[PDB]
């Protein structure tokens, strides 16, 4: 509350650490469905159904341009990529499996870097 604070966590490396995690996700072999925005002209149903599209290139741009106010807003966008994937893709499909693999890979990196 006012004048009552927990001890100050050092957040000065968060920007660089999120950038590193994002690089790791970009270079994973299963990242290909997620690297670029879905083409809303060429994929029927995607624009209407997925209310907030998100992809790794868009996260990179947002991160590099100071649009994440803290590491939690970064994690929300990453998770959105995979939540979108689950909405649009059967679990039993290459893209569906890609999304689950990438989500697990992210969550481990996230815990190991910060938790």
Nearest to 113 by CA among 5, 11, 27, 8: 11
Q: What is the CA radius of gyration of the chain?
A: 16
CA atoms of 111 and 107, how far apart (whole Å): 6
The resolution, in Å, is 1.6
| Distance, CA of 34 to CA of 82 (rounded, Å) | 9
Nearest to 114 by CA among 9, 7, 5, 8: 9
Asked if residue 81 lies in contact with residue 34, where contact means CB atoms within 8 angstroms, the answer is yes
CA triplet 54, 59, 65: central angle to 5 degrees?
135
Structure tokens at 16: 């660089």
Q: 82: Cβ–Cβ under 8 A, 6 or more apart, which residues? A: 99, 100, 102, 103, 106
Mind listing the domains of the chain with CATH numbers? Answer: 1-115 (1.20.920.10)
Token pair of 98 as six digits: 């890609």
56 by Cβ neighbours in 10 Å (0-12 / 13-18 / 19+) ranks as buried
């Amino acid at each position: 509350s006012m004048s009552v604070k927990k001890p100050k966590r050092d957040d000065s490396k968060d920007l660089a650490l999120c950038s590193m995690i994002l690089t790791e996700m970009e270079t994973h072999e299963d990242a290909w469905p997620f690297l670029l925005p879905v083409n809303l002209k060429l994929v029927p149903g995607y624009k209407k159904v997925i209310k907030k599209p998100m992809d790794f290139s868009t996260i990179r741009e947002k991160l590099s341009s100071g649009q994440y106010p803290n590491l939690e807003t970064f994690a929300l966008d990453v998770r959105l990529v995979f939540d979108n994937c689950e909405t649009f893709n059967e679990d039993d499909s290459d893209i569906g499996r890609a999304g689950h693999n990438m989500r697990k890979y992210f969550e481990k990196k996230w815990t190991d870097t910060f938790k």
